[PDB]
């Protein structure tokens, strides 16, 4: 069911916070874990000591995940350890700004680390699994856990870049799920909240008992990641989960709110205008595509 | 109401196809139109003659919309013409490939033209409108019409790059709508289908109006560019043929809540595996054929 013994996972952004917790959690479930982050961050991290304590083998590979060489080395490292079973794309940075103040660099940096980084490693893994399945019996074990956000669903006012990257990640994940399904590989997206040193500004410090868990502990997220990494999740593909606390929300696809169909084979501009204007004039203010 | 006389619009990817059609449509409604596309494409286009024929002023600005200089020149040009009222981000390219065969170049090119191009011009317009409202009475006329796609909702197997760019665009649009609302500006996204030289491969040749005429899309763009759409902000519209579909936000399908203050891994596993046991493989976060 959940045993990952004999499997190799790659986790990005793993020196600290959620990625660190994911790497440790996969190690506890039995996986050999390849951890990636920026070199300085890896150097100060206890992640390898914690993977060892968890009873597994860990290997660190430094690099900027937005660069092709990094995703190449991660897959090569995994192959040398006996194969690649699990990819967790977690690496990210924020560069928040309201749109009218955002610089080109703030936009580009966020798109590169989140969206290009997710692309490079997911594409590399996809190519690897396709080749492995071709050399074998047409199937291969594989799991992709990608990291979206509620921001991709809501387009926050201070996060046009991060919202766009995260919405792109969701669509990339859906496409990956379609491409990989027939080989037995599954790909899904999570949208987590968890209290870490990076999110301390947003969530505040840890509250309050023997046995109680922090409502925003990384533990809550890791438990889902462990499932999504495991044979148990064979029936789960192309899904988006929101996760924090003792609660996992499976998100439903967008639907049609209203169809506006002309009487004839084309809308007269005046008729469509009156129709839409009059529909919106009697409709809720906050209601739109934002979730 | 619908009259765009006295207003200045900028349309990207305007040499051909949908962008050309949108530029002509805004001109017909009364706007002065600044058209942008790649140099060679603009040089060969009839778009300026068609704008002139619709009875309006057109000006061509060549440039790669993924490069900062282009968005800068577009806003400067519109300012020289009296102001900037309407931005239609339409420029785009496809580089389709299944994910396991997609090159870095194929991915990056699509992200650049669609997502960066949309960012650069929407950000430049956002800055312009914010400044214009500050210098005036705190309000300014503004409309953004951005171009997403049903691909952003479905994540097509052949289009991981295009799907990601178009989903990105929708989120960018939502954020712009939140940032600009208070100045009176409105921003919305469209997800069109229309038969053009570029979509001839997929849709076929033309067989009363063509069910996939660009006219169907242009009619909605005219509304979204106009005073009539003051009440429309942060929306996603699918449009083709005589039908416009307003898209609703995602909802929660199912909440899986632990009995205690954390899920036991084995408990969450059995719960989720049981829930997915007899599931239609098509049921997921992908949305398809919402017009139907």
Automatic annotation (TrEMBL), chain A:
State a single Gene Ontology molecular function.
oxidoreductase activity
Q: Which family does it belong to?
A: Belongs to the short-chain dehydrogenases/reductases (SDR) family.
Alphabetized InterPro entries for the sequence: NAD(P)-bd_dom_sf, Peroxisomal_Beta-Oxidation, Sc_DH/Rdtase_CS, SDR_fam
Q: Which UniProt keywords apply?
A: Oxidoreductase
Say yes or no: keyword Zinc-finger present: no
Lineage at the top is: Bacteria, Bacillati, Actinomycetota, Actinomycetes, Mycobacteriales
Q: Spell out the protein name for this chain.
A: Oxidoreductase, short chain dehydrogenase/reductase family protein
Supply the Pfam families for this chain.
adh_short
């Amino acid at each position: 069911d959940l045993d990952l013994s004999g499997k190799v996972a790659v986790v990005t952004g793993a020196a600290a916070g959620l990625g660190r917790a994911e790497a440790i959690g996969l190690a506890k479930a039995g996986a050999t874990v390849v951890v990636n982050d920026i070199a300085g961050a890896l150097e100060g991290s206890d992640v390898l000591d914690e993977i060892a304590a968890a009873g597994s083998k860990g290997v660190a590979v430094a690099g900027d995940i937005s660069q092709r060489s990094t995703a190449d080395e991660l897959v090569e490292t995994a192959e040398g350890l006996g194969g690649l079973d699990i990819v967790v794309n977690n690496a990210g940075i924020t560069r928040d700004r309201i749109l009218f103040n955002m610089s080109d660099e703030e936009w580009d940096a966020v798109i590169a680390v989140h969206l290009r980084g997710h692309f490079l490693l997911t594409r590399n893994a996809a190519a690897y699994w396709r080749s492995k399945a071709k050399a074998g019996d047409g199937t291969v074990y594989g799991r992709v856990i990608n990291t979206s956000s509620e921001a991709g669903l809501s387009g926050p006012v201070g996060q046009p870049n991060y919202g766009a990257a995260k919405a792109g990640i969701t669509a990339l994940t859906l496409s990956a799920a379609r491409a990989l399904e027939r080989f037995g590989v599954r790909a899904n997206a999570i949208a987590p909240r968890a209290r870490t040193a990076m999110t301390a500004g947003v969530f505040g410090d840890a509250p309050e008992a023997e046995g109680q868990m922090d409502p925003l502990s990384t533990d809550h997220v890791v438990t889902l990641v462990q499932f999504l990494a495991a044979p148990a999740s064979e029936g789960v593909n192309g899904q988006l989960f929101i996760v924090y606390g003792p609660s996992v929300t499976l998100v439903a696809a967008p639907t049609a709110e209203k169809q506006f169909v002309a009487d004839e084979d084309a809308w007269e501009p005046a008729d469509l205008s009156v129709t839409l204007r009059d529909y919106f004039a009697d409709r809720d203010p906050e209601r739109g595509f934002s979730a």
